Design a protein around this motif. Structure first.
Motif, short mmCIF file in Angstrom:
data_model
loop_
_atom_site.label_atom_id
_atom_site.label_comp_id
_atom_site.label_asym_id
_atom_site.label_seq_id
_atom_site.Cartn_x
_atom_site.Cartn_y
_atom_site.Cartn_z
N UNK B 172 25.85 78.04 52.56
CA UNK B 172 25.02 76.68 52.95
C UNK B 172 24.91 76.33 54.23
N UNK B 174 26.80 76.09 58.51
CA UNK B 174 26.85 76.68 59.84
C UNK B 174 27.54 75.73 60.73
N UNK B 208 17.29 82.70 45.53
CA UNK B 208 17.27 81.62 46.42
C UNK B 208 18.06 80.48 45.67
N UNK B 210 19.06 76.85 44.56
CA UNK B 210 18.41 75.97 43.90
C UNK B 210 19.10 74.58 43.95
N UNK B 211 20.41 74.32 43.99
CA UNK B 211 21.16 73.07 43.94
C UNK B 211 22.14 73.26 45.26
N UNK B 212 22.67 72.13 45.60
CA UNK B 212 23.69 72.12 46.68
C UNK B 212 24.52 70.60 46.51
N UNK B 213 25.65 70.57 46.10
CA UNK B 213 26.54 69.46 45.82
C UNK B 213 27.57 69.24 46.91
N UNK B 251 19.41 72.39 35.43
CA UNK B 251 18.18 72.21 35.32
C UNK B 251 17.66 70.77 35.62
N UNK B 252 18.48 69.94 36.01
CA UNK B 252 18.37 68.63 36.64
C UNK B 252 19.12 68.37 37.85
N UNK D 26 13.09 70.90 41.02
CA UNK D 26 14.07 69.80 41.20
C UNK D 26 14.69 69.54 42.63
N UNK D 28 16.93 69.40 45.73
CA UNK D 28 18.07 69.85 46.15
C UNK D 28 19.57 69.43 46.30
N UNK D 29 19.25 68.16 46.78
CA UNK D 29 20.40 67.47 47.19
C UNK D 29 20.43 66.08 46.27
N UNK D 77 14.07 71.19 54.23
CA UNK D 77 15.49 71.21 54.25
C UNK D 77 16.17 72.51 54.41
N UNK D 78 15.53 73.78 53.66
CA UNK D 78 15.73 75.18 54.01
C UNK D 78 15.50 75.61 55.30
N UNK D 81 18.41 74.37 57.56
CA UNK D 81 19.49 75.17 57.30
C UNK D 81 19.60 76.35 57.95
N UNK D 83 17.02 79.43 57.05
CA UNK D 83 16.51 80.42 56.08
C UNK D 83 15.27 80.90 57.20
N UNK D 90 7.96 82.29 50.42
CA UNK D 90 8.13 82.48 49.16
C UNK D 90 8.59 81.32 48.09
#
Lengths: 239, 358, 23, 99, 384
Positions: B172, B174, B208, B210-213, B251-252, D26, D28-29, D77-78, D81, D83, D90
């Protein structure tokens, strides 16, 4: 003292000490300690009058007691070479350890002194001590001086035992450390520092390029740091 | 609840043990000395575990990762494959076959990487089993640059195994960071851990994210484990010389809470390994303080806590400086499903020994 | 030698010159 | 506490018309969701203030919270980053010109 | 300079790292570590591969890392083009470039201009000083590993072809013990600047060969980092740009050469402090008007700065997939390491009308060599 003019440093320290000796305030103790440090170091470095340096460092030790100060005094006394000086250095280091507790720097200095003095019982005791440091004392040691000391002590007491296990454990705990991968795999070390994961200097990066033992990489590392000896020597040794 | 010891083999290795995994037939262990051992899951109760241990030399750099995949192929074709990672950065897929002549084992090295994928260096991997979602198996592996890879394993094309590279997912951040832990789920999700403290979630189908914590100082992700049945993810944080666990809901992308004991921290020292049980109510926790803590996911309260420094049987006790009062303990723990020994508990410790619980 | 240094041991311009010369 | 990518992705609500027809994925962060909540609360307060003094609003101002104006935060956001545009397209709910 | 459009490129042009690049009105010269010297024709037509109009010659087995070309019309009709290179072994070589009458092919002719006593030194950097109304003779300046700067005068005639190099004098290092002289430059007003590995720059007068200034660009002397990589004079102004290291960062500092005082530094926010590039600055270049400066970074970016306001203008990113012919793309090196963002070794501004082709006829151009063993050409949008 920083520039290297020991005679002028001694003259100015003597003048400052003479100008204010009977004063008792907050701004006098700092100047007294600074003058004592300057006098002792300037005598030791060039004057070779180890008796005057010993007297001034003894006065300084009488006047103050801090970890960095006592460590510096111990290193100077050890560098003097006298048996009494070494005994005093070890004694005052142990006294500080008893008074204030355990710290990594003092332990490392004592271990280095013992390794340079070849005390088998002390070496074994320190090896027991160094191999059981808390995690707080390992997060702070960012340069992995302790694992190097463990390897050195292990190889100097059990013939040719392999002490790479401490490096493997440190890499398990710290996979993103530049020092740990030196002993395990130079490929990983070159890759990790390559693209900005870690901050690496030009000399170190040039050393990493040359260590792949390839003509293209050797030319690259010699272009980066042309004054490096190893780079030019390796390029000469190619063909 | 209550856990009873069954077997205990001491001095199993000469170098320390970094990871343990098991299948329905045998328990495989890996150590830093380069020897890959297997323990017989099905064994007589009144017999020493060391009597049924089969060893094999793997690599000189040293191993720290291992995962075993067991399945039944077409007809009655038994499948038992093992993958592992050495400290140099090589993937070493091994086949396990049992000789019916004298109950022996066949350590067979297998090569499934081309000339370009052999030039990388890997840290963490985990086999993906075949569920009702999709027929093919899968494999995921991390990298020292943060990248993760995903093959599709085709066991037949007769016995002609091949690896088909579906794609890669990058880090994620850089500049990149060292990828430390990876995990896969039966619902089609992939999770990756980093020493910075960042967890990223992707899915198998589309590749791809989906989430990032997000989270001296040390905040490194040690363990990442998805729930066996449901939408939940457990994360093992690092505090300043402390251990933390945090629960997340899939999923949330929301946060459920954190597990803690009174002194929020879970262990006095770092927390190393996590493992869900078959149904998914109890969470075990391996720590560097030397204690195992079982937790209830539903109520977010500790159920029990084991101490293996003393056999006979809580508060986070720290000294005047902030250090744990317990000696360093366990590297890895594991759950075994029903009917694997005669639920179990595999535990490999700093004392170079291995212990079992039921 | 300086007066301050002597006292311590015991206890132990250009534009004007040019203007006058020019005139 | 936000990161540059998070701030640049959050500000895309003020430039996206939000007239799409797909279900939003949903967030992403978590910080993006927190910023979305903050912006929605601020806009509700502003709507109350506007309606107190009886100002005629435009079509876009009246239906700011009734549209899907936060549906491009993930795409921005992507993109920030790093992408590629193929993956961005897509995962996007719109066409190339909109992005 | 705000918009730059790629016009041509050539991936896998050399077999090893391309360490330097230089250009003239007729062609562009590249030197690599494989020991070859490649001449690329500047007057390309539409739909022409750059590698089709290229010529190569082998010089030294140890490889080359510096190159400079001098082109001038010495007489009413005589034209001379000279290429000077230095190798890893430390040799200074001179070549005369000429073209055939019928085939229009490039011919390489080796020249011998250094005496036997001059061949005992190890030179590192070099720079051609062309005639710019300061004096009627061309100049050549070079540095060695001992820290000394040498100055020559080139005499083509003795029209009869008989080249000869005459030594004017030497300038020694300002500090004891001597250090490594890493870079050198010469201005049109008759000034010489030399950089050293400790962070010190010395400026001397071309006519009399005596030092003038000695300023120190080190942020702090705690460690022995911060060597000088590139020194460049402004084309018309009294300004000198310094590229120096800062313990894994890249910095650029501006000085004015009339009195030798620090003016400022160029920096951008990067993942605090005053740093211009993330990794290192390897090269610098001024445009024709001297208002824009281009810095080549090891991080793989070309940054353009406004000299007067000391603010960044635009950034160009380098990728291995920018190569037109897909068969020439080098994704990974010989060890499998990625080259998606390769560092830049050298960058050069080409004057207007030097490089012709796809719309580049009336505006300034630009050339750079990267770590993926490629050479790339750009043009500034619009005209002048």
């Amino acid at each position: 003292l920083g520039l290297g003019n020991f005679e002028l440093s001694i003259e100015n320290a003597d003048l400052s000490q003479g100008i204010i000796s009977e004063s008792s305030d907050e701004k006098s103790m700092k100047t007294k300690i600074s003058n004592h440090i300057c006098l002792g170091l300037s005598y030791f470095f060039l004057n070779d009058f180890d008796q005057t340096l010993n007297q001034f460092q003894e006065l300084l030790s009488i006047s103050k007691d801090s970890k960095h100060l006592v460590v510096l005094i111990a290193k100077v006394l050890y560098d003097v070479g006298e048996s009494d000086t070494k005994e005093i250095a070890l004694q005052e280091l142990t006294e500080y350890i008893a008074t204030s507790g355990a710290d990594l720097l003092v332990t490392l200095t004592i271990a280095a002194m013992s390794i340079l003095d070849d005390k088998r019982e002390d070496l074994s005791i320190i090896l027991e001590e160094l191999k059981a440091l808390p995690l707080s004392k390992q997060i702070i040691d960012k340069h992995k001086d302790a694992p190097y000391l463990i390897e050195e002590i292990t190889k100097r007491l059990y013939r040719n035992d392999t002490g790479k296990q401490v490096w493997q454990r440190s890499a398990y705990f710290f996979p993103n450390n530049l020092k740990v991968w030196e002993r395990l795999d130079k490929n990983i070390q070159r890759r990790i520092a390559s693209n900005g994961q870690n901050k690496v200097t030009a000399e170190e990066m040039s050393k990493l390029y040359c260590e792949s033992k390839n003509l293209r990489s050797i030319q690259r590392g010699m272009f980066l740091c042309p004054w490096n000896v190893t780079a030019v020597k390796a390029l000469n040794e190619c063909f | 609840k209550v856990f009873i010891a069954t077997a205990n083999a001491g001095k199993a290795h000469d170098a320390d043990i970094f990871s343990v995994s098991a299948c329905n037939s045998f328990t495989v262990s890996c150590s830093g000395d380069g020897y890959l051992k297997v323990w017989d899951n099905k064994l007589l109760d009144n017999e020493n575990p060391k009597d049924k241990s089969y060893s094999h030399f793997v690599h000189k750099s040293g191993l720290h990762h291992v995962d075993v995949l067991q399945a039944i192929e077409r007809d009655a074709f038994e499948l038992c494959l093992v993958a592992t990672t050495s400290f140099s950065g090589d993937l070493l897929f091994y086949r396990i076959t049992r000789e019916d002549e004298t109950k022996k084992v066949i350590f067979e090295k297998l090569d499934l990487l081309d000339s370009d994928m052999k030039k990388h260096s890997f840290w963490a991997l985990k086999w993906g089993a075949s569920n009702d979602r999709l027929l093919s198996h899968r494999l995921v592996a991390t990298d020292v640059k943060g990248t993760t890879y995903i093959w599709k394993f085709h066991p037949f094309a007769n016995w002609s195994p091949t690896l088909e590279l579906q794609g890669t997912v990058e880090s994620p951040m850089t500049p990149s960071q060292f990828a430390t832990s990876v995990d896969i789920s039966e619902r089609g999700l992939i999770a990756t851990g980093f020493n910075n403290g960042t967890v990223q979630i992707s899915e198998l189908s589309t590749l791809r994210p989906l989430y990032n914590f997000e989270s001296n100082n040390s905040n490194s992700i040690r363990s990442v484990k998805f729930s066996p049945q449901g939408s939940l993810l457990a994360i093992a944080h690092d505090s300043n010389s402390f251990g933390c666990i945090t629960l997340y809901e899939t999923e949330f992308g929301e946060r459920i809470g954190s597990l803690s004991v009174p002194t929020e921290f879970a262990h006095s020292s770092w927390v190393m390994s996590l493992s869900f049980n078959d149904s998914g109510e109890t969470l075990c926790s391996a720590g560097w303080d030397g204690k195992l803590r079982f937790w209830d996911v539903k109520t977010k309260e500790r159920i029990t806590t084991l101490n293996m420094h003393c056999d006979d049987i809580d508060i986070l006790a720290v000294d005047e400086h902030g250090d744990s009062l317990a000696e360093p303990g366990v590297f890895d723990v594991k759950f075994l499903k029903k009917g694997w020994r005669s639920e179990s508990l595999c535990c490999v410790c700093l004392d170079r020994s291995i212990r079992w619980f039921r | 030698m300086s007066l301050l240094e002597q006292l311590a041991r015991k206890r132990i311009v250009s534009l004007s010159l040019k203007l006058s010369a020019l005139k | 506490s936000f990161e540059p990518e998070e701030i640049v992705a959050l500000l895309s609500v003020f430039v996206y018309e939000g007239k799409t027809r797909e279900e939003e994925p949903p967030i992403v962060t978590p910080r993006l969701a927190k910023g979305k909540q903050r912006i929605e609360e601020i806009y509700k307060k502003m709507l109350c203030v506007f309606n107190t003094h009886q100002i005629p609003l435009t079509q876009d101002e009246a239906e700011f919270l009734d549209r899907k104006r936060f549906a491009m935060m993930n795409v921005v956001y992507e993109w920030a980053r790093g992408l590629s545009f193929k993956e961005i397209m897509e995962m996007s709910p719109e066409a190339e010109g909109t992005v």
